[model samples]
Target chain A: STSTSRATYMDRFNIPKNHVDLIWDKDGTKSHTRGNTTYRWTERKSNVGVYVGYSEMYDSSAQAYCQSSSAKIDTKTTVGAPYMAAGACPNYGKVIAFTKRDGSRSDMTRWKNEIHANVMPHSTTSCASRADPGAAEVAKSIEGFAMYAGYLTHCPYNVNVYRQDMVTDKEFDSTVCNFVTESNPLRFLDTTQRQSTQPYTEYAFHGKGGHKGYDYKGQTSHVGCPPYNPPHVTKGMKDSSWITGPFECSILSRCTTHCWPYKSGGNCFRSLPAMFDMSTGECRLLGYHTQDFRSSTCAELTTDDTNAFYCVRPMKTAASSNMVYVTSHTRPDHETKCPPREPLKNVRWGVVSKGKYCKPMNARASLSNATAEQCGQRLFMLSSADGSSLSSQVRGYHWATFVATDCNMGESCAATARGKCFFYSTVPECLIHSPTTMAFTSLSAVDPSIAIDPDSIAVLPEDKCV
Target chain B: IVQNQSSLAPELSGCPPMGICMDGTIGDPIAS
Candidate 1:
C-alpha cells in the first residue's frame, strides 16, 4: 500500500521539496519506510541554484536517512571566499564549497569580487535585461566576460564607462578606450596628484589643444631650456688691450716718455713749440714772429713781445707739421712757410706718452728707453693742436684717449689730443683746467727736473726734418 | 554542468551500505 508522505515535514524544516525523493525510519532493528522507497542508499547530483537534502530528519534511535550524503552541488561547486559568493547567498553569504564558472578554485578575493560584481550580473538573463537586447546578450557570454576583464586590466578606469552601469553596457568599446594601463592611473583613481577631481582626458575630449600633452619624459608641462639664439654684432669690436690707467699726460709725463729720432743718435731732435721748463716746472710757449729777421727794420723785439708773438696758425700747417719752428732766424717773414715740426719719426706718437695720440703705436715700445721728456713734448704739441696754452687740458685729453682705445698706445695719443682740444677750446677753458691741475698735482711724486727738453742739448740735423 | 554527487560520497560500511550524511542523519526504508 502507498505509505504516508513526510514531504510536508521536509517543507516545515525549510528543506526544499524538490530535494527530497524518499524518506524512512528504522523501527526497532528492522527497517520500516514510506512511499515506493528503496532500502539501499545512493548519491545524486544537484545544481547550485537547486537545493538537495543530504539526509532525512530523524532521531538517532529511529535510524533514518536520505539517499544522498552530499547536496546543493552544481556547476558552481568551487569553494570560495565569503565575498565571492556574497551575491548568491543572503546576508552577505557564507563561503560554502563553491567554485567559479570556469571550475577554478576561488582563492583570489579580488578576482572573486570582480566576477561577482561585474561578471555574475551579466551572466544572468534576468539581471542583464536591458533596452539593447543584442548588447545584453553579448555582455552575458564568456567572450563578454573576457572583454570586460581585458578592459579592466589594460584600460584606464576613466575609460571604463561600463563599470558603473553593467546591465545595459557591461563591456568597454576598444575604440573609445585608447589609453593602456601604464604607470599613470586614471585621474579619478589617482586622487593624490589629481586633486581637482578632473579627468586627465577631459581636455582632450573637449578638444582643447589635444591635452596639454606630456613632456619628453611623460610629465605634464615641465620646465626646460629654450633653443639657442646667438647675439648680433653691431659695430667694430674693440680689441682687449692689457694697458690700464694713467692715460692722462700728467700721469704719463711723470713716467718716462721715449721719443725716437728720425735716425739713431741724430743731431736733430723733434720738439714741441712749447716745452716743459725743468727750472719753473711749467709748460712755456716759444716766441714766434711774422716779420723778416733779415731786414734791419725787423729787430729782435723783446720790448714788443706780447704784440708781435703769433699764436694762431693755419689748420693745414697744424695738420701737417703739428707745430712750427723759426728754422732761419735770418729769413723769417710773414709769408715764409715755417718748417713743419713733428715728433721724432723713430718714436711712435703714443709709445712714450702712453696716451691717446700714441694709442696706434705698439704698447711694447713704451717699455723701451723712451724718455719722459718725449712724452711731455708730445703731450704739449697735442695740446697745442687744440690752440690751448694750458698744460692741464692737454694732459686731460691724453688721459681720456688712453682709456678709449682700451689703453693701446697710438689710439690713446690721438684720442687724448682730440679730447683735449674738444674739452679745452670747445667747452670753457677753466672747466677742464682744474681737473688737469689736479691730475698734475697727483704726479708731484715724479721728479719734474729729470724730464728736460731733448732739443735743448742737441743741435739741429737737416736729415731730422722731412 | 552539475557535478555528480556520487563522486564526492565517502565509502560506506554497514547493513544496507549508506555513506555518512553531511547533516549526520542516515537510514533506509525496507519493504518486508
Candidate 2:
C-alpha cells in the first residue's frame, strides 16, 4: 500500500492545514533535530511523493512535486493502508466559461464563434473595442502570455485554457510567487529573486504577522497566497512583478514563521533541526542552527576528527512530530557541557567522572596554550544523547580526556593545563544509517585506562559524515 | 461585463495537448 485513508501523517506531526512546508526528501525522508528545531519530509517517488508540484510553491524540494497549481501526494501509509491523495489547484489561474446563451453548456462554440467575429472587428481599432480592462492588462503587461481555449466534459464554456507563462520564458524573468490579497488585483508584474535580497522567498511565512499562510494536504484545495501589505514593497517592485507566480519558498513560509533561534523541540531528538543556504534556498540537516555564527545561512557545517568538542548534525537525525517532546517527562540531560562548565582542574570531567556522558565529536587539536573558550570557540557541540528529559536516537558515550603542556590564553597554565584532546586514536566512522537514526555511529572514546569496550577502539565518525 | 475572476488560476491546466494550444491573436482572444 502506498497511501493512507486517515490524516494520521498530518496528525503525527501536529501540522495543521493551510500551512506551508519545505520538504527535503531527496534520499528518502530526512528526519533531523537539534536544540529546539526539527523537520521531516517524505521523499519523492515516480514524480510524486510527499511534495509534488511544479507551480505555486512546490519546487524541486524532493519528496514533493507540484503540477500546475496543485501539490500532489503519493504513497501515504497509516494503519498499514496507503493511497494516493488527490490534488486541487489553487484559485489563482484564469477562468474560461463560454456557455452559449442559446442552451448554456450545449453550444459555447456557436456563441464564441459569433462573438469572436464581432469582437475582432473593433479589437484593433480605437472606438470599436470591448471592456474587461483587467484581462487586457494581464495580456499587455507581460509580453509572452498565451491562453489556449479548448473544449471540455460537454460544454465548450466549462473548459480549459492553456497559459504559456507557467512553462517559463526568458523575456519574463522573475520569481515564482506574488502577494495578492486585499491589496493588488491583477496578476501582473513578476516576483523578485536576487542575491542577498532576504533569507526567505515570500513575506507570509517570514514570522511577521503569524498568518500560517499555506496548506499541506489541501483539504481538497489550497488557499493560495495572501497579499502584500507591508511598506517595504516599493512601487517599482509592485510594477506587475508578480506575473510569474509564487514559489516553493513561499509555501514553506507558512510553517516556519519563527524559523530562527530554534523552537525548543523539548528533546534534542524530537526536534531535529533543518537549515538552509538562504542565498540559494538549499537546505540541510543539523544538530544546532544559528545565523549568528555568520556562516552562510546555516549552509556551511563544520566538524573535527582529532579534537573532541565538535559535534556536527547528522546527515539524518531522528525527528518525528509524533513521538517527540511529550510533557510530564524529564528534560534530556544527556549532554556533557563543553569547557567542563569550569576549568578542567587536572582532569577532564567526563573522563574522570562516573556514569554515561554525552560525547562531543570533531575535536580540533590545540598545540599552543588553550583555555575553555579556546576549546569552546574552536568547536563547542556534542552528538545528541538519550536523556531522562529527552530522547535522542544516539545514546551518551564514555569520553576520554588527556592533558596538555605549555597552554596560553589570558594567562598561561601555571602548571600543565588539563586538555579535552583524546590520548589515542579511534575506530572507523559509522557508515550505516536508519530512517530514524544511524547505526553504530559512535563518538570518540579512546581511554586506555577504562574498561568500556569502545575504549579499545575509539569511534570517531566525524570524518564519515562530511 | 466579462468576469475575469479565475483567469490566472490553473483550473483547466490538465485539459489537452500543449502543441495544440494556440496563442491569442490580434482580435478574438477568448476563442480557440
Candidate 3:
C-alpha cells in the first residue's frame, strides 16, 4: 500500500502553469487593497478609499530666470508637474477622477480597459522631454500618468499624537515672604509627564471631495511617463502636462478647484528640514495638504465672481473629526501671604537638575542659537510607504530640514541657490516607464498520455496489470 | 519494451492530412 504524503518528481519544477492543471482562485482576503480590484461600499468603510487622479503644478517665474541666465531654453519640454512652466517649458496639469458611474465591478473593468487603452501603452516614456506631440507621445504620457495615479489610489493618510519637550512640568506660585523657600517645583514636571491619554487613529480616506489631489504615490508615479526621443530637449511641455486637463476644466468652468499637491491625500512631510539654500540663499518650506476646490456649483458658474479655495477635510469618522489644538490642563497657582520662593538652587529635581542648582528665576527660556527650535507649525503628517508605522507599509511625513545661510533678498532665491540641495537619498525618482501592452491569446486544448518510471516499469512483470 | 520498428511510413490509412487552424486573423503566438 502506498502513502500519499511523499513528494513526487512531478511535484518539483516541471511544466509551467500552461502545462499544469491551472486553476482560478478567488481573492480570499477580507479587504481589497489591490490596485486592480474595484471595491465599492454603500458608504466609505475602514481601509477603503478612492484613488484620485494625478496633477502636476508648476512655478513659472523660477523657470524663466534659470533659462535666460543659465542654459538656452529648449523648445522640447520634459513632462513633469510642480516644475517650472515659463521659459524652458510651459506648466501643465492633469487630473484623474472616477465618474460616479465608474464605481461598479463592471465599471472598474471598463475603467481599467479605458486606462489600458488610453494610458498604459506609453507609460515608459511619459517623463521624456519632447519637442513635438504625436500619438506615441500622448500614449506614453497617459500611461505614465495613470500608473502613478493608481499608486495614489491606495496610499492613505493617518493621524498620531505625541508629547513635546517645551511643555515639561512646572508650577506657578504667587508669594513674597521667605527668601529661602525650598518647595520643589518638580510637581510641574511630573504633571506634564503624567498627562497621557487614549491613543486614537484617524484616516483622511475620502477621494471624491471638491479637491482632486494626487498622493505621493502619484507624485512618484512621474517615473512611469514615456521617454522622449531627445532626452535633452524640453519643449511642448503643456502638451504632456499632467495638470492640463483639470486646470483648464477648472478655468473654463470658472471653478477654483485645483489639483491636490503630489496628487495624494496624505499630509506630506519633507524628510529634510525646511531651510534656505546655503549657496544661493533660497528659502523653501515643507508639508502640504490635499483639498477639493469644486464642492459647490462653482463648476457650473460662468464667471469667477467669488473666492474659491480647497479645504483640507478631517476624517469622516466621529473619532477623528476634530482638528488639532492647544489647551492648558491647569492654571497658574496663586496664593497670598506665602513665603517667597527662593531661586531653585542646588536641588536635584524631578528627572535631572537644570544644572548644579535650580533657581526659581531659571525659567526655561525660548530656544535661540545653534540649537534647533520647535515651531508652532507642528503638523500631523503621514510618512511615505517605506515600511514604517502600523501599516507595515511606509506612511507618514518625513522630517525635511531646510537651511538658509546666505541672506540676499531681492534676486530670485532658487536661482541664487541652485547648487545647495539636501534631500532623502533613498527617495525614488519618478521615471517615465515604457507602456504596458497586453496581447490576448486564446486558451488551447491538450491531450494527456500515461507514463511510468523507466526503472520501475522495466522491473515490473509484463502482465502485472493484466 | 515491445519492439515494433518499421521505417516504412506508418500506414497512411490510419492518418488523415494535417490541417492548419485558420481564424479570421493569425492568432497570438502560442507555445508548442
**lDDT winner:** 2
Better of 1 and 2 by lDDT: 2
lDDT of 1 by residue, A1-466 (tens): 1111222211211211111122111122222122232122111221111110111111111111111222111111211110000000010001111223232342211111101111111111111122221121111111100001111111122212122211122111122122222233222112122224231111110010211111111111210111111111111101112111111111111110011011111111111112121222222111111101112222121122211211111111111111111111101111111111122111111111211111222221121222222333332323221111223323321211111112222222322321120111111001011111111111111112211111211111122111
Q: What is the TM-score of chain B alone in each candidate?
A: 0.22, 0.17, 0.14
TM-score of each: 0.12, 0.21, 0.15
Query: In candidate 2, which residue ranges exceed 4 Å CA deviation?
Result: A1-203, A208-366, A379-466, B1-32
State which candidate, 2 or 3, has the greater DockQ.
2
lDDT of 3 by residue, A1-466 (tens): 1111111211111111111111111231222222233221111111111111112221112111212322211111111122111100000110111222221111111111101111111112223332221222212212111111211111110000000100110111112101101231101011112222311111111111121112211112132223322111111111112112211111111110011111122111111011111222221111111211223422221222222211111111111111110001000110110101110111111111222211111112211211011100110112121111123422222111112234221223411221111112121111111111000000100000010011111111112121
The C-alpha RMSD in Å for every predicted model, in order, reads 56.2, 23.6, 35.8
Number of backbone-clashing residue pairs for each candidate, in the order shown = 33, 68, 80
**lDDT for A183 (candidate 2):** 28
CAPRI tier for the interface of model 1? incorrect
lDDT of 2 by residue, A308-373 (tens): 111112111111001111010101111211011112222222110111121233322322344232
